[PDB]
Amino acid sequence: ADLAFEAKSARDYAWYDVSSFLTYRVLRTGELEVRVRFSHDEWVNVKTSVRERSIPVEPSECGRVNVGDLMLCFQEREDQALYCDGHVMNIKRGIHDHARCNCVFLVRYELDNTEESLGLERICRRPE
Ligand SMILES: [Zn+2]
Numbered sequence: 259a260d261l262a263f264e265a266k267s268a269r270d271y272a273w274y275d276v277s278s279f280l281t282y283r284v285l286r287t288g289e290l291e292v293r294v295r296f297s298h299d300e301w302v303n304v305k306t307s308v309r310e311r312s313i314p315v316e317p318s319e320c321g322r323v324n325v326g327d328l329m330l331c332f333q334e335r336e337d338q339a340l341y342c343d344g345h346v347m348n349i350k351r352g353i354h355d356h357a358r359c360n361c362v363f364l365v366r367y368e369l370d371n372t373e374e375s376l377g378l379e380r381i382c383r384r385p386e
Contacts, residue, residue: 312382
């Protein structure tokens with residue numbers, strides 16, 4: 259029930275689970291950064307690059323994912339595999355039960371603006 263966090267690396271713009279927070283600093287420009295240890299230690303901007311951890315979606319609740327939603331998406335390309343922000347553009351709804359969702363979510367990645375068709379098993383929702 260404790261709050262848990264993910265942080266966005268300024269190295270590759272992808273999100274990583276935070277194990278703990280070590281210290282902080284203020285840049286001369288006024289920006290506040292925290293030093294995080296990941297579940298390697300990095301400085302990350304508090305305002306833009308630390309948030310409550312994204313949440314897996316169970317097959318029985320795939321209806322809660324809607325066009326326009328911000329999702330954390332598993333983006334696998336070549337031998338690179340990053341968790342990146344995307345927005346759901348389109349949903350092809352499938353016939354399925356509680357065991358496995360077969361709906362297809364077309365996502366558009368925020369950073370490079372590319373699109374990919376993903377299953378529920380590669381996307382996580384934001385809290386609230
Ligand atoms: Zn579904």
